[model samples]
Structures are given as structure tokens and as C-alpha cells.
Target: RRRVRAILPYTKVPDTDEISFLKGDMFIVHNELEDGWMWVTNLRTDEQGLIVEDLVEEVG
Candidate 1:
């Protein structure tokens, strides 16, 4: 597992409980997904969601 944070705002898909966060929102990466997406859990919300791979970076 790894920690990461949003570098931009990502709107949630209407049909999913996917988390949407602004710049600097932190999450713990659960796994990498297909099509440049990654499964992660929001540190603050504890909500899981898929986020664009390029939109976040692993926290050192």
C-alpha cells in the first residue's frame, strides 16, 4: 500500500460512490486498475474510489 494525493479536482461518476477531491486531497492506494486508473481510499473520508493515475502522486 502507498499514500498519495490529488493534484487536481476529479469529479465523481454519478453511478459510483467514487470519491471526488480537490488539489492536495490524500488517499491510500489500494491497487492499480485498468486504463490508467488506480483504486484508493481517501484518508479523510475512508471512501474508496478510482482516480486517474496522472492526477495523483505517491507520497514519499
Candidate 2:
């Protein structure tokens, strides 16, 4: 389980978890889905969104 972090916010659609981020900030990542689309979360914040491969930087 690797954690991610950024300073900007964007957007995305997700399951019941719901995607909600203004830009980016130590968000969560899941399954390096080959679709080029990756699942993400903000932990304490509202989340469960798919962050685009071209939409973010995956920090170890």
C-alpha cells in the first residue's frame, strides 16, 4: 500500500466512496489498473475516485 501526495486538486467519479478533491494532497492509490486509470482516496476526506494516469503523479 503506497501513499500519494500532491498540492493541487482535480476531480473524478467513483463508487459509494465518492470522489471529492479540490486538487491533490497525499491522496490514496489503488490497483495500477492497466486502463491507465487508477483508483484513489483521501483517507479522512471524501473519496473513492479514479485518478487518471495523465492526471497525477504516483509518489512512493
Candidate 3:
């Protein structure tokens, strides 16, 4: 529903298939997911993936 900017680089952890992204990457947040994760779409790559909530911050 809103945009956020990745403040840190994130690599997929453990068994998840989440994609990796770098700091300053832009994403559109759909909503929160289970276990502190969120469903988002990368604005740069136009890829959809799950990301940790703490890795991103709300953007203007």
C-alpha cells in the first residue's frame, strides 16, 4: 500500500526462497506476513519477494 526503502542488504536466510536486495532499493509493501516478514515488490527489478520488516523503512 506504500513505499519503503531498504536500509540494509538482505540475503535469504535458512530454507526460504526470498530474494536478496541491497540498501537503498525501493519496494512497495503489500502487507505484513508471518514471523516478521512482509510481502513486497522491488521497484528496481519489478520482482516480488518476502523481506524482513526491519530491513526496510517507510519512504516518502
Task: Go through the candidates in order and give the clash count of each.
Answer: 0, 6, 0
Q: What digit string (tens of lDDT, one per residue) describes model 2 on residues 1-60?
A: 577765566654544434556545666676667786667777657456666556556685
Candidate 3 lDDT over residue span 1-60, tens digit each: 889999999877666758689999999988886687888899988988888888889897
Comparing 1 with 3 on lDDT, the higher-scoring candidate is 3
**What is the C-alpha local distance difference test score of candidate 2?**
0.62
Clashes of 3: 0
Candidate 1: Cα lDDT at 46: 76
Q: Taking the tens digit of each residue's C-alpha lDDT, what string does model 1 give over 1-60?
A: 789888898889888756788888898888886786788888877788878889988788
Model 1 lDDT at residue 60: 82
Candidate 3 stretches with Cα past 4 Å from truth are: none
What stretches of model 2 exceed 4 Å from their correct place? 13-18, 44-46
Q: Which pairs of residues have clashing backbones in candidate 3? A: none
Model 3 residue 57 CA deviation (Å) reads: 0.6
Scored against the true structure, residue 30 in model 3 reaches a CA lDDT of: 89
Instruction: Please give each candidate's TM-score.
Output: 0.82, 0.56, 0.82
